[model samples]
Target: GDSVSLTLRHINVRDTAKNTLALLEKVVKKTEAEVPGATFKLDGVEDTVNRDVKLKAEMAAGKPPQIFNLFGGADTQNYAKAGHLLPLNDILKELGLEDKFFELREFTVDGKIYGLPEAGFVEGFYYNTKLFADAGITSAPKTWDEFTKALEALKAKNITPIALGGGSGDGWAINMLANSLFVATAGPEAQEGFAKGTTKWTDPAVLDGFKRLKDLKDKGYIDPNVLGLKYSEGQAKFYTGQAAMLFDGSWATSAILDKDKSTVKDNVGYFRFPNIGGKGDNLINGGWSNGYGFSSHLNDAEKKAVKAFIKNFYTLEIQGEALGRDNRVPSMKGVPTPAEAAPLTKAIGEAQASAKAAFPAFDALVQPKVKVTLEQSVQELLGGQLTPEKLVEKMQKVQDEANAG
Candidate 1:
C-alpha cells in the first residue's frame, strides 16, 4: 500500500486567500531542503463557510486532514474542546519550542495545544497619507482627543474620516473595534468580566464607551449610510479612496500594497487608537495568532512531518519570507520586517512589548450563538434602530443567556 506524503490544508478569509496560498506553496517547495526526501501536498481551502462545514463533516467521518489550519482562536478552542484536535503541548515541552511560541499558544484550550501559529495579525489603523498631508496633519494621534481632532480636521477638509463596515453581517467590524476600545478605556479586568458576563453592561465604563460611539455617530463622523455596507462594500470604499482612514488589521497592508486592488497603495499610513479622555492606553486591537489545527488521526510519520513544518513555519527565516511576501506581522522575533511595512507596525511592536495587559477578542471568547446576537446588535445599533444604551442592555442579556447555556 502506498501512503500519501504528508497532507495539509489551509483556510483563510477572502482577503488573504491568495497570498497565504503563495506563502504555503513556497514552504512546501522549501521543505525538500529542510527535510530531504520528504514529499507533501498542500492545498488552500478558501471557501470558508463550505470548508468549515467540510472540516466538520470529515471529522465526523473519522478522517480529517493530517494537518488542518484555519482561522480564529475560537475555532481552535472549539475543535480542541470537542476532542478532535491533538494536544501539542506535551510535544512542545519535550521539544523545548514551548517558550519561543508563548505569545501565540494561549489561544489553545483546556491545556491542549492544537495549533502552531503561522503568523499573527493584530488590528490597528490604516490611514491615507495624501488625506493627512492634504489636511496638514503631520503626525499620528496619541490620545482620544487628538484622534477626534484629526477626524474633525479631515472632515473640515471635506475628506471622509473613517471607513467602517456597519451594514449587513459585517457589523462585527465595529463591534470588534468597540470591544477593544472598551478594554482600553475601562481596564482589562473590567473588560474581561464584562465579556465573560461577570460585569454588568450598565456599568459606567461600558455606558461611556457606547456614548463615545454614539457621539461619533451623532456628529456625522462615520458614514451615514454605513448600515447598508458589507465588508466588501466597505473595503471597496477604502480601496477607491472614499475614506481617509480604516480601523483594520495587518491584512490591510496587503490590500493597500497590492496594485491590482487598492487606489492608495502608494499613500497608506497607520496608527494605534488614541487614549480618549485619558481613558485607556493608546492601544489599538490585538489577539494571539493564526495557526493550523490538527486532526487526531495523524500517524507517527505524519506527526513528525507536521512538527517539521511548524518548526520551519515560525522560524525567523520563513516568517520573514511569508510576511515580506504578504503584508502581515511575523510572530518570530528578529524576523526581517517588510521594509515597506507601515512604520506603525514598529510602533505597535513597541507597545505590545511594554504593555502591562493583553485581552482576548470578545467574539473569539464566546460561543457561536452568542456571536450571532452580539454581531446583530451592533449592526442594528449602527443602522440607527437601537440606542447605544439599549444595545448594551441587549448584549448583556444575550451574554447572560449564553453563560447559562
Candidate 2:
C-alpha cells in the first residue's frame, strides 16, 4: 500500500529523442495507474556506448538501478553470467504465469529464470504484398526454387527484389541475415553441429549459401549501396516503396503504427526464408526470451516492487496496449490481438508457425569475444575481404579457443 518506486534506464539509439521520451512516459503512466503512485523514474542516455560506460561506473559505485532492464539479448546474458541479477523462477510459479510465458523464461541463467519477455519477435522476410499479388504469387515460398522464382518474377516486373540492412551498428545485425539464410540451407542436423562448434564451415551448403548472397549482390537484386546505408535509412527506402522487400526482425511493425514513419504501412507482408532446394527447411533465427533484466543489487522491497511492475507491465491489459498502440507483439499469453495491429502480424505468425523450429540468434549464443570475432567475420565477408569459407573457419577456430579458455 506504500508507494513502490523504481529507477529504469536505457540508451536511445535513434535521433527521435522526443518520440522515445513520449513512449516511455506513456509506459510509465500505464504502470503507475496499475500500481497507484508507483514511483517510476526513467533515465534515457543519449548514446548507447556512453550509456554502457555510465552503467558500469554506477554498478562499481553500488548505485545501479533496482529495476534495470538490460535492453535484452546480450546485455541480459552478460549481467546474469556475472552474478548480477536474480532469477525469476519463484515469480513465475507464484503468479501461475509460468505456462503463460511461452517458454520465454529460458533466457534466464543457471536453470533459474530471470526475466520475462518484454516483447515478442520472429525474424523473416518483409515483402510488399501487392507486388507479390501482381507477380502472380498467391502465397509465401517454401523451397529455394520458389523463392528465386518469386524474386525473378518481381524483377521481371521491373521491381527491386530484396532490400536488407547489413552495414549498420558494428555490422552485428547482418548475423541474423546470414544465419537465417544459413539455417534455410543447412537444416537442423547441420545446425546442431554448428551450434556445438563441430560443424565445418567448408560444408558444401555453407559455401553455397555464401555464394547465393554474393550472387544476389552481383546480380543487382539488392541495392548496391545497402552495405553503406544505415539500418533505418534502408528500411525507410523499403517502407516508402523504393524497395520491394526487407529482411528484418518483427520490431519493424512498431514503426508501422507511426504513420509519420511508415509509408507502406498497410501493404507489408511477412514470409519465412525458404528451403534451399529441399536441402533444409526454413528455420527461424528466433528466441522466446526477449526482454531486459535488472541488476542483482536491489533491496528486498525494491526487488518485490520491480517484480510487481513487470507482472503488470506484461499482463493482458498492458500487452494489448503495447500491441494495439505500438504495433508490438506481446509475449504474454491470452492477450487478444487487437485488430489495429499491422496486417503483417498475422503473416509473421504464419511464417513463424511454418518454420522447422527456432533457435536463439546465433550471435547471441556465443561468448562476447567470440561473438565479436564471428560478427566481424560476417561483416568482412559482406565487405568482400573474407570468403564465406574463411568466415566459417575463423569463427569455429575462435569459438573453440574461447571455449577452451
Candidate 3:
C-alpha cells in the first residue's frame, strides 16, 4: 500500500493512439528510472467517460489520480477553485516550461496555471482523393459555393458526401464541424463574447450556420438518420469508403492513416473547413486544452515523478515523434515535424498554416451547461426536432443561466 509511485490516467487508450501511447510508455519508464524506487501505474479510459463521468466521480470521492487527463476552461476553473487541483505554475517554472506551450489561456485561472496541453488540435474535413476523382471533382473546395457544388457532385455519385456521428449518445462529434461553422458565421472574435454576456447564440449568424448544416442534410449530402451512428461508427463509414469526407479533428489522423484499421488509408487527405461566407472565414477551429492535470494531494515522491515525467515527456524529440508517427499537432513551439511523417500528416500541417487565425471550440468559450445544451440541441437539429431558431433560443436560456451566476 505504501509503494513509491504515481497514478497516471490518460485518454490515449484508443487503437489509433498505440504509437503515441507506446512513446508515452517510454517516458513513463524513463521517469521511473530517474526517480529512485518510483513506479508509474498507467491507467487508460475513454475520453468522454473520463471527462464527464469517472473523473467527476473520483473528484467527489477525493481520490482522483495524481496525474489525469483533463480539459481546460471551465473544467480547470472549477477543479482548481475547489482545491482539488494543484497549481502547476511552480512546477512549470521549475521545469522551465512557462514559455513552451502554444496557448495557456484555457488552463489559466486567475493568472495561475492548473494543467498543460499534450498536443494541439485543429478541426477540418478529411476527404478521400479517390472519391473526389471518382465523382469527377478535380480538387478540394476553396470556397463556400465550391464546397456546396462538391457535395452535390459527390452525392450525385451515390456516395454519402459526409460521414457524421450525431447520434443520441454523442452529439459532440457532429459539433466538431458545427463549432467551426458557428465561428465562421459569427465572426472570429465574436465567440469569446458568449461567456462574457455580450454575444447571443440567437443571432442570425448562428442560425445561418445551422441552416447551412441542415441544408446539407436536406440535399442528401449527409447520412440519413445520422443520429443513428455513434462517432466511431461514423468514422468507420468514411474509412470503409461509404462516405467521401469526414469532418474531424487532427487527432484522428492516426486511425485514418493506419493501414490495418482503414481501407482508404492511402487515399485520405485533410483540408481546412472551407469558409461558408461568414465573418470568420479566415479563422479555423484549433486549440490545445486537452491534456494532463495533477492532484493537489500528492506525496513528495509523486511530485518528483511528475517532474521527471515532464522533463522526459515534454521534450521536442518526444513531441516530434508524435507529430511524425501519430499526426499529432505540436503544442510546443520548437517541435519539428519529423522527416518520416506521413504524407497526410504533413498535409494537415500545411492546412494549419493556411489559417490566418484560430479559435477554440465553443465548449472552451462558453459555460459547461451551455455546451451541454448545444450538444443536445445539435442532435435535435439533426433529427429535425428543433429549428436553428429554437435551438439558439434554448442555447441563450442556458447562457443566461450560466452568466447569471
By lDDT, the best candidate is 3
Per-residue lDDT for 39-132 in model 1, tens only?
A: 7766556433333456767766767777776545656666676677878787777666677754755456756677776666667677888888
Residue pair clashes in candidate 1: 144-275
RMSD of 2: 3.7
How well is each residue in 169-214 modelled by candidate 3, as lDDT tens digits?
5788878888888777778656788888787888888778888777
Candidate 2 vs candidate 3, TM-score winner: 3
How does candidate 3 score on lDDT?
0.84
The residue pairs that clash in candidate 3, if any, are none
C-alpha lDDT of candidate 1 relative to the true structure: 0.68
Tens-digit lDDT track of model 2 for 199-256: 7556777767766776777776776676787676677768877777888888776664
Q: Give the top-scoring candidate (TM-score).
A: 3
Better of 2 and 3 by lDDT: 3
